């Protein structure tokens, strides 16, 4: 029975079972994955402190990024205050090294922790443990447990960012640390420091003004906030909190954000409206992987007004078959492969075999190294 | 009469004449540009050598970038060889500091040089000089006069790059070096070194396999090659060569790329077909800023086959009024303001008043800091 964490636990338990039964298909797949993982063992651990331009706190351990749709104003002598262009990522985002470094850290730790659970090999736990210590708990390299300066917007006064949805990159790795507990490399003191950081980040999330605001966001940001919250609570074994969050926040949010026709109107107004409709459902999906491990199915449990998240999957399914039919603003081509994992997760959750068929027809490449597809041999 | 260089010499002479005559509308405008200039005066000269990851030569003085549409192949263990995703810029490009640093250098030097020609104040010549020496001729920080490692593709190293079209950024600055000759800051020693560099770089453009290959290109890359060629040649005052290139390479190239309806088939098969149709004419427009200073008008001179640049503007002109009508693949929005400068140059060259009128209705922001608009008070 898999420990509580940020992954489809059914798919992981069965890959581990089949790997240990020596089944030929799974064993070939896992050996492939093991070759993909090699770069993660040799990879030097990343730190949030590897930046030159410091945040207003002057502390390199504070995570800082630029809100990706905000651009210098050509008509102002210093380009301040920045102006918003929805859907156009300002390439200055890549001058803040946390942005892509949290992604690389997140990929390494997730790939290594999963392969530790599946194979048992101590070597993967050791590499995982090394990325975790440096990114989180280390007293010089470790990241401070806050997102004060995520998605800053130059020239904005109070505007205390535009969200900390960036967290999902490293908070998936936080959840995966649960998989290496009991290994020889992850000592009891390692787990205490990490618990203590997670307790401090959860507190920041629930009590800081930026946390409270993001807990009440009206679009996919509120949904991603709770997905991240659940990752942190599940790492801390706060399963009753997980139940309070789903019933008192997640379910209300879907009740309001889904319309009667199953569309997501807060996302339909974006310049990337098919992408953000999917990005909202991607949040529910990852929240569900955690909630359904304690018997709460977020795809079919209704909100108090009777709406269910499956109505929104229903609304998008035709356009996952033919994105060209999408009739709202989408100023960049939509990646259809995002529907495979999505329809497979909603599909199995609902007994909708039409969804699952379509997920496999779309499929994921067998030899892909995208770590988020490691559990999905079934789509390969 | 203005020195020969990469700019609309008619607008430039005009601004300098009116500035010196104390005309109020021009003196106000030039006083705004001087405020915008102030950052370049304080700015630390940039160098191609500021990078960690070295090129195959292990020379930091070798300019090196990644070809923008080539991405890792996630189906291969080392991501190698990269695959092409037309029109999708790979954020890995920003890990090559030259790509953006050539932009910042080019903008700084262009603006200082032009303000020195217009205003005559030595402070702009002195700052321009400091950037040109550092980027070009300094014996430690100066880039080598080649583009061997521009637009490399990892894995496909077996071949070459994908062209050196990035040169336009710093070769405009090379052209504007001409405008500070005669100042106190630009010594005869300075100008001799730059001439020697321009000569070496010119040799490389014409005799290296990568230059020869690029001079043969059948699309917008052939046209940008010559536009860059003319900038170097004009800097070197080789006005006979500018005629030969104009007459034997640019017009026949332009003529081969224009269909009977005026479309540019090589650019219509691109995922950014309106951006690339416009980008081809922008090469011709910058080429023509140089050729028409010696009496060759590329907008109205027909090629051997009877095609003329004016036909390709005609095809595109409706879609500059209404870019939404564009019936070909354009997977990112198109900046309609690019049509402002393009229809004014083409229109003035052709005596087409409807083009100029539309150029001024689209216009440019009076207070913009985009340095390529500095000559275009007529549009603001």
Explain what this protein looks like in three dimensions.
2 copies of one chain form a homodimer. Chain A folds into 2 domains: 37-215, Chondroitin AC/alginate lyase (Glycosyltransferase, Alpha/alpha barrel); 223-380, Chondroitin AC/alginate lyase (Glycosyltransferase). In chain A, 52% of the residues lie in helices and 3% in strands. Chain A has helices at 9-20, 24-36, 38-42, 98-119, 122-137, 168-176, 188-207, 209-215, 220-235, 239-257, 265-268, 273-291, 310-321, 338-350, 353-362; strands at residues 64-66, 70-71, 83-84, 149-152. Chain A has a two-stranded parallel ribbon. In chain A, helix 6 runs parallel beside helix 9 and helix 12 crosses helix 14. The PDB classes it as lyase. Keywords: polysaccharide lyase, complex, alginate, mutant, lyase.
Order of adjacent strands in the largest pleated sheet of chain A: 1-4
CATH superfamily of the largest domain in chain A: Chondroitin AC/alginate lyase
Give me the strand/helix succession of chain A.
HHHEEEHHEHHHHHHHHHH
E-strand count of chain A: 4
- CATH class of the largest domain in chain A reads Mainly Alpha
CATH topology of the largest domain in chain A: Glycosyltransferase
Largest sheet of chain A: 2 strands, parallel
Multimeric organization: homodimer
Overall form of chain A: globular
Q: Report the CATH architecture of the largest domain in chain A.
A: Alpha/alpha barrel
The number of helical runs of chain A is: 15
The helix/strand class of chain A is mainly alpha
What is the radius of gyration of chain A computed over CA atoms, rounded to a whole number of angstroms? 21 Å
Intertermini distance of chain A: 24 Å
Give the domain tally of chain A: 2
Largest binding interface between chains: A-B, 21 and 18 residues
Helicity range of the residues of chain A? 40-55%
Share of residues in strands of chain A: under 5%
Keywords (chains A, B): Lyase, Signal
InterPro entries (chains A, B): Alginate_lyase_dom (IPR008397), Chondroitin_lyas (IPR008929)
Domain Alginate lyase (chains A, B): 47-326
Protein name (chains A, B): Alginate lyase family protein
């Amino acid at each position: 029975s898999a420990p509580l964490g940020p992954f489809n636990a059914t798919l992981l338990e069965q890959l581990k079972n089949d790997y240990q039964k020596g089944e030929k298909e799974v064993t070939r797949y896992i050996e492939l994955q093991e070759k993909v993982a090699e770069k993660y063992i040799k990879m030097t651990p990343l730190s949030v402190t590897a930046k030159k331009k410091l945040p207003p706190s002057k502390d390199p351990r504070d995570y800082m990024t630029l809100s990706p749709y905000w651009w210098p104003d050509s008509t102002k002598i210093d380009g301040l205050p920045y102006i918003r262009k929805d859907g156009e990522r300002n390439p200055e985002v890549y001058e803040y090294p946390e942005r892509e470094n949290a992604n690389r850290f997140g990929d390494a730790a997730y790939c290594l922790g999963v392969l530790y659970y599946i194979t048992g090999k101590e070597v993967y736990a050791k590499a995982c443990a090394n990325h975790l210590r440096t990114w989180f708990t280390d007293p010089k390299l470790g990241m401070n447990p806050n997102m004060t300066y995520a998605n800053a917007v130059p020239g904005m006064k109070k505007m205390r960012g535009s969200g900390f949805i960036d967290s999902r990159r490293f908070s998936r790795a936080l959840g995966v640390a649960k998989l290496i507990e009991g290994s020889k490399s992850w000592t009891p003191s390692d787990k205490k420091k990490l618990d203590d950081w997670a307790t401090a980040f959860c507190y920041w999330m629930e009590n800081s003004t930026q946390g409270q605001r993001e807990s009440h966001a009206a679009n996919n940001h509120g949904l991603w906030y709770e997905a991240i919250h659940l990752m942190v609570l599940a790492y801390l074994d706060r399963t009753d909190r997980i139940r309070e969050v789903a019933e008192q926040s997640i379910l209300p949010k879907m009740g309001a954000q889904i319309a009667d026709d199953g569309s997501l109107p807060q996302e339909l107004k974006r310049t990337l409206s098919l992408h953000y409709s999917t990005f909202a459902l991607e949040a529910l999906m990852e929240a569900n992987q955690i909630t359904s491990q304690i018997g709460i199915n977020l795809w079919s449990t209704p909100a108090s007004n009777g709406k269910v998240a499956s109505q929104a999957v229903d609304y998008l399914y035709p356009f996952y078959l033919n994105p060209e039919d999408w009739k709202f603003k989408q100023i960049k081509p939509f990646d259809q492969s995002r529907a495979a994992i999505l329809l497979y997760e909603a599909g199995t959750a609902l007994g909708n075999q039409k969804y699952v068929d379509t997920a496999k027809r779309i499929g994921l490449k067998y030899s892909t190294s995208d770590v988020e597809t490691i559990p999905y041999l079934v789509l390969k």
